[PDB]
Ligand binder design. Sequence first.
Ligand SMILES: CCCCCCC[C@@H](O)CC(=O)SCCNC(C)=O
Ligand SMILES: CCCCCCC[C@@H](O)CC(=O)SCCNC(C)=O
Lengths: 170, 170
Amino acid sequence: TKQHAFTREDLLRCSRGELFGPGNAQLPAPNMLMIDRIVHISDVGGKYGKGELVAELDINPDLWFFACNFEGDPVMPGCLGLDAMWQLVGFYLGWQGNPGRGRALGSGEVKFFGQVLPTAKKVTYNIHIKRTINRSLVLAIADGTVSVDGREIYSAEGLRVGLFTSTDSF
Amino acid sequence: TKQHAFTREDLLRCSRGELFGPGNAQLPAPNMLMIDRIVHISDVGGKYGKGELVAELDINPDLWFFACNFEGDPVMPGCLGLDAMWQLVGFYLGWQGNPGRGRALGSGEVKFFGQVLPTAKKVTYNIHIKRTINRSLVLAIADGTVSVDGREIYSAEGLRVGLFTSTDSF
Ligand SMILES: CCCCCCC[C@@H](O)CC(=O)SCCNC(C)=O
Ligand SMILES: CCCCCCC[C@@H](O)CC(=O)SCCNC(C)=O
C-alpha cells in the first residue's frame, strides 16, 4: 500500500508477473491492457470510505479496436472500458498485499450512456472500493465510472474480482 | 427474419455492412468479433417465448487473447464473452429488419463462475430475447449464458443493445 501512483512501465511489469511476484495478481498485457497509468490509488476515501483509484487511458485514432469496431463506425468497445474497471479492482487486491491470480467474477448494473471516439484524448476511470474480504477467499466489490475528456459515459455497480492461488475450480 | 443459421463468412459480410446494408447493424470485425457461427436464430421460443439465438465460438490455443490474458496464465477475457452476448443481441435487432447502428447500453447482473482455457474446444452462447421496442427507440433486452464444452460458465441478465440512426446522441 506504499506507492500511490503507477506509470505504464509499472503496469507492464505487473502484466509480466514482475510487480507482485510468483502466483500473484497480473494485469493483462497489450492488447487487452486498458490502462496507461494509475494516477492515484489509496485504501482510504472514495464513496464508501474504503479506498479508491483514479486511472487513465490515452486515446488516439490508431488504437487497434477502432479499426474493427466497427468498420466505418469506429467506437471503443464498451466491454474494454468495463474490463479496465475489473483490471483496476484486481490490481487493488494485489496492491493491498493479497496473494493469488485474478479472475473477474462479474458486476451488478452496467450502463453505457456515452461513447469514446477516436478523436478523444483521454479516458479516466474512477473506482470506489465498497468492500474487501481476505479471510478465506480474496474478494473485492467496487463501483466504477468511465469518463472521456471530462464527460461521464459509463458506470458499473458491484464490480466483483477475486484473487486465487489455484484457478482449477473455474 | 428468414435465414435461421449464419456461417462465419456471413458474419464477416455483416461486419462489412453488407448483410443489413450501409448505416445498419454491423458486427465487429476480427479481432473484436467473438462469434464464428450463428447456429439458430428465431423470433419465437426461448425462455420468454420472445425469441432466441444459439451461437458458437471455436476455441484453439492460438487465439490472440490467450497470449496477453494473462502471460503464463491464459484465460479468455470474461469481457469478450460478455461482448459476444451484446454482439448477438445487436445482430438480432438487425435481423428483425430495424435500421441503424448498434451500441451496447449495458446489462443487469453479470456472473463469471467458470473459465475458458486454451485447451477448450467450443464456446456456446445462448441468448433469450426478453423484450424489443421497435417504435421510437429501437431497443432489445435479453438474458444470456455462455458455456464451454457443455459446461455453463457465464450469465448475464438484462443485456441491453440499441440501434441508432444517429450516434451523435452518444
Ligand atoms: C492485476 C490484476 C488484474 C486481475 C483482473 C483482470 C481483469 C479481468 O477482466 C480479466 C479476467 O479476469 S479474464 C477471466 C474472467 N473470469 C473467469 C472466471 O474466467
Ligand atoms: C450487430 C452487433 C452490433 C451491436 C452491439 C455490438 C457489440 C457491442 O459490444 C459493440 C458496442 O456497442 S461498442 C460501444 C458501446 N456503447 C457505447 C454507447 O459506447
